[PDB]
């Protein structure tokens, strides 16, 4: 499929109109970031000489 | 097959047409001794990564 | 075009497989870079017709509805100013080295196995994302990213950003025409700077 | 550490060292229990190949 | 930068080879249209809001904070006076209450 670019909605603009919310929802969202990878090392004699 | 290392006893089983084994095909992990039919796996002499 | 290849593959193609994996990782990384820079908010707000922006002229940066292409005027000059491979390499490779996305496979065999993959996001989609960001900002202030449809006049948005920098609303509302004229003149100066082949 | 770093002065921290400490001294040979010699002479002195 | 909506808190939690955040955000809803004005000209002088916006339901004007709809009567402590109202474009006519 073509990529969904986003939520499709329209807003009405006027020079003397403002929209103010009358309610609110407290939403808790998760987001995940990596920190570190596997800490590795190589042994030279076992690698080359064996 | 000549080399330098320390050999231990192994629990591997060898097919009758197989004498030399490789787990990772760069070093011979185990050999079958020509006199006694026990299988001895060879490890590198210096190891542990000091 | 070697007469033996499978032996050569089995002996030395694993390095190329690893390096091709590195290139594929770089490519997916680059696509995710474009994703994270242009798709921060996935909301598509249609550009309103230019009405009552307080005297500010945004007709240049907004896309023109007359043109079927969704590129606006300033980004059109940005596209025309940058010429892909403006050197002797366009004579050597026939512009196939750049990502024109209409290149033929004769350019691919010209490069001897090197290929240019098209980007994940079409430039038209980038233009649509930029138009959505511009329309959302100009209409709703900073409430574009929170997630809502909070329309606000542009005068009050200028007033609250003036409160942000530390100046009261009265300075804006007494000098609205002067600020609009200065902004329009600055946009015209940017237009003349890009249009004069500088 | 001085031998792996190729310097007579080392700095503070941890360093990984290659094996310079052990050398083999004895050698063993293990061959199959074969006693009889090959008929190389019989093949080589053959009156007609 | 820390979640969709206005950020309030984040709670860290450990993860294998990473860290996860629990972003607590303020997401508004249930919008309402309102007729607004930039200022109010009373007694020949313009009144600008110290905080929030000027909104009107029907024919009565109030001052409310931007993010939430809390209607408050227009009061001289809530507004500040600066100049006359002939220079402000789009100013409306109303009275300001003084306590
Ligand atoms: C704002 O929305 C919340 C829900 O998101 C409303 O809370 C509900 O209120 C009704 C009646 O008081 C209860 O029966 C529901 O159980 C409540 N829901 C939750 C999730 O708590 C709240 O009333 C709304 N406020 C306004 C002014 O509309
Ligand atoms: C915003 O500026 C553009 C030009 O930068 C204006 O477009 C011009 O409009 C006049 C007629 O109004 C034409 O004669 C010119 O040819 C147009 N120029 C270009 C480059 O298109 C536009 O009218 C301005 N918008 C407002 C609201 O003033
Ligand atoms: C706009 O909303 C306000 C707040 O509810 C209204 O003010 C009160 O409305 C009630 C009911 O109509 C009256 O009994 C009070 O006397 C009003 N108080 C004040 C200080 O005016 C106001 O009436 C609403 N405006 C319209 C046009 O409905
Ligand atoms: C707000 O009220 C003032 C008067 O208190 C209005 O000013 C008058 O407007 C009429 C009609 O436009 C003129 O004929 C008068 O000459 C004006 N008098 C003065 C002293 O300016 C003003 O127009 C009103 N504004 C709004 C938006 O209703
Ligand atoms: C090989 O010969 C030696 C010497 O006679 C003997 O000790 C050993 O057991 C033999 N190994 C066999 C038969 O596997
Ligand atoms: C060849 O050598 C073998 C020993 O390997 C011997 O038995 C044989 O008699 C020799 N034959 C001749 C013709 O010398
Ligand atoms: C506000 O008005 C616009 C157009 O007049 C309309 O599309 C929108 O739904 C209205 N919003 C509310 C909350 O009624
Ligand atoms: C809003 O626009 C209408 C129509 O263009 C106009 O009559 C009115 O004066 C404008 N009001 C303001 C405050 O700009």
Swiss-Prot record, chain A:
Consequence recorded when altering residue 10 to L: In strain: Omicron/BA.2.12.1
Positions of glycan attachment: 15, 23
Function: Precursor of the fusion protein processed in the biosynthesis of the S protein and the formation of virus particle. Mediates fusion of the virion and cellular membranes by functioning as a class I viral fusion protein. Contains two viral fusion peptides that are unmasked after cleavage. The S2/S2' cleavage occurs during virus entry at the cell membrane by host TMPRSS2 or during endocytosis by host CSTL.
Record protein name field: Spike protein S2
Species per Swiss-Prot/TrEMBL record: Severe acute respiratory syndrome coronavirus 2
Designated gene of the protein: S
Residue numbers of the full-length protein present here: 695 to 744 of 1273
From Swiss-Prot, chain D:
Glycan attachment points: 25, 27, 33, 45
Protein name: Spike protein S1
Effect caused by changing residue 45 to Q: Reduced viral infectivity
Ranges where the record places region Disordered: 21-37
Outcome after substituting residue 48 to K: In strain: Mu/B.1.621
Recorded name of the encoding gene: S
Task performed by this protein: Attaches the virion to the cell membrane by interacting with host receptor, initiating the infection. The major receptor is host ACE2. When S2/S2' has been cleaved, binding to the receptor triggers direct fusion at the cell membrane. When S2/S2' has not been cleaved, binding to the receptor results in internalization of the virus by endocytosis using host TFRC and GRM2 and leading to fusion of the virion membrane with the host endosomal membrane. Alternatively, may use NRP1/NRP2 and integrin as entry receptors.
Subunit structure: Binds to host ACE2. RBD also interacts with the N-linked glycan on 'Asn-90' of ACE2. Cleavage of S generates a polybasic C-terminal sequence on S1 that binds to host Neuropilin-1 (NRP1) and Neuropilin-2 (NRP2) receptors. Interacts with host integrin alpha-5/beta-1 (ITGA5:ITGB1) and with ACE2 in complex with integrin alpha-5/beta-1 (ITGA5:ITGB1). May interact via cytoplasmic c-terminus with M protein. May interact (via N-terminus) with host bilirubin and biliverdin, thereby preventing antibody binding to the SARS-CoV-2 spike NTD via an allosteric mechanism.
Organism of origin: Severe acute respiratory syndrome coronavirus 2 (2019-nCoV)
